[PDB]
Symmetry: D3
Subunit: 122 residues, 6 copies
């Protein structure tokens, strides 16, 4: 569930951190095209693709099981797609945290003209 | 008027049904690209194209005349574009109802990466 | 800042005028592709590109200095990107006003199928 | 829950009818004081009272079982609070339908100055 | 209607000014009780009273005729309720302009605890 | 400001916790009258009172300095009103944490009929 994904992100970077990834670069947020603008943006490209490969369930609506163990995300008893979905978010959340140090505020709500490049394939 | 279109859909499938078609597949909702994912999604592709061919009026803002006769949509006294607009929505609404049995919840809020295919032309 | 841009537009065309440019043609609003549908729409294409060329700052979040002198927008003490950003909005706002006489309501919330053309380059 | 209440209303009066009751008279909607303006308003006063008597569950959030039978609302196999909640909703929706011909559009978004009278106890 | 009221305010005070009056003091905005905090607040109390006296039409929804003449608001050829509504709005907007220099930003989103005093009758 | 208040709450109780207090009991959220339903509600009554005593600044908008130290909230070097505001928020957030085990989900979106009792002075 997207709410859970936001939960992981905020649990990893702090309250409201999810908002730093709503419309960032060319792939973080609604839709996605062109080429990733940086590490953080690539995290979203990867996440988008991870979702694209899920079948049998809805990655943004399906509810899975997970938890935090000493500040680290932990996908619990999951089978099939649910397992895949949790894995998609867990990896994306850690990827944001891992690349926090290079987050470029100038990429927030990036201009449409800057993602006109060819859409890298999954 | 989009409110009227939502009226037809809800009148044909039930209260709030319109929300099942707000962001479904690759063409049901804001924007549209790639190739239709199913019958329901093709209904939206057709609807989008039907609008694209309307001239002289705004398909999403223009108000037309219509009504329900024994559970069936009926475009009334319409001339020119208004006639075309009502026809676009009427057909789309019946198309959703006609294909209700194959509606795939997994297509709601479909990942951007799954509509990367070539944009079928109208 | 986008709020400032809306300020210029409304200051030039009247209260709430900004809403006439939120989703107009193929480039006025969120995202932008295909070919401009008219003068007004080209104003937005130009504006989008003007933003795309800004570096070092966020064109939609950065706050610059400006004012109205006898009904005319005036970018004040600005240096670097801020200067560029204000210039982008000032030009766009005047461009809307300049082409008000050809504004086509039928272009508001234009169908996705009507911007399928090749995306003109900046 | 409130969504089910809305479906009851819409199922009895037509798509979007619930909106006719979001801010009507002195009681239809958030808060409520003063003299009811008509039968519809009286029923909103009662609906709130009915919710106020519920214990052990959240009337606006709890999900109960119900359905439509030949156009009439039927509360399903509910026990305890869920049964009371479904009833509150059923009675309120039937009342709106019952009094649809006296519904006065002039009471929509009523000024607070017309709801200052003393308030009756539930 | 309220949109026209907003244009009056913005036309007199500048773009987005209406927002300065959405939740100000004890009366500018939904509900209202207690002692007005200043002239601006007093005028909001009156505006609500003025709407409350209207009969035969919905003050917040009804559309009347008006225009600006040399910076001043002029209510057009309105009869019955529409004339009263336009007046309520005109007087309120002129009052906000009249008292713009005493407008106190500290009264924006005022705590409810400061609006408990007895309330004056319209 | 309110955003800082939300971060305090979320930092003490977890992501999105602030939402548990947007419309809870008779005082947690807009308006407030009647008898508090529990300790949490009592603290909301006080929080509003605390804001109501502030002068010279807008409690909901003013930005103060604060931080977290070993899980505890610390108000920074604030003078005048900013110090009082930070305190109002700190005390309220700590109270919600203190009483999280008595938090009753049945009081979320409480019916107005349960908040009619006389109201205590601040
Ligand atoms: C190409 O697109 C790929 C998506 O990019 C991945 C990055 O996503 C970060 C933002 O994701 C969310 C999370 C939650 C939400 C909702 C609306 C569910 C909740 C909210 C408003 C509390 C953040 C929306 C977007
Ligand atoms: C490529 O895009 C083609 C559009 O897809 C067609 C399917 O449309 C279904 C949803 O359409 C609506 C209908 C109404 C609305 C509004 C916002 C007017 C009303 C609302 C919120 C009550 C549903 C929005 C979208
Ligand atoms: C390709 O896209 C280019 C953008 O098109 C340029 C035209 O922009 C006109 C509309 O721009 C705005 C201005 C302000 C706003 C916000 C949300 C900041 C404020 C609001 C709601 C008050 C209008 C949104 C869009
Ligand atoms: C607080 O209510 C006091 C009593 O009034 C009873 C009349 O209620 C009218 C219907 O109320 C609502 C309000 C909101 C909604 C939500 C927000 C859940 C859904 C929506 C937007 C689809 C209408 C549903 C029903
Ligand atoms: C309920 O009012 C009590 C009396 O207060 C009078 C002061 O009113 C201030 C302006 O009020 C509004 C509120 C909302 C609006 C809407 C939502 C219609 C439009 C918007 C969002 C563009 C401001 C317009 C004017
Ligand atoms: C009016 O308050 C009366 C006293 O109640 C105190 C409890 O307050 C709970 C938290 O209140 C809010 C409300 C809104 C918000 C905003 C809208 C600023 C931010 C949001 C949406 C992220 C929660 C923050 C905190
Ligand atoms: Ca409906
Ligand atoms: Ca009754
Ligand atoms: Ca304006
Ligand atoms: Ca007065
Ligand atoms: Ca959070
Ligand atoms: Ca206390």
């Amino acid at each position: 569930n997207l709410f859970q994904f936001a939960k992981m992100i905020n649990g990893k970077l702090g309250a409201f951190s999810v908002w730093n990834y709503i419309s960032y670069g060319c792939y973080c947020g609604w839709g996605g095209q062109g080429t990733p603008k940086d590490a953080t943006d690539r995290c979203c490209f990867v996440h988008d693709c991870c979702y694209g490969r899920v079948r049998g369930c809805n990655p943004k609506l399906a509810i899975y099981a997970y938890s935090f163990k000493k500040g680290n995300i932990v996908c619990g008893k999951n089978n099939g797609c649910l397992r895949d979905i949790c894995e998609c978010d867990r990896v994306a959340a850690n990827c944001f945290h891992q690349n926090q140090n290079t987050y470029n505020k100038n990429y927030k709500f990036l201009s449409s003209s800057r993602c006109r490049q060819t859409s890298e394939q999954c």
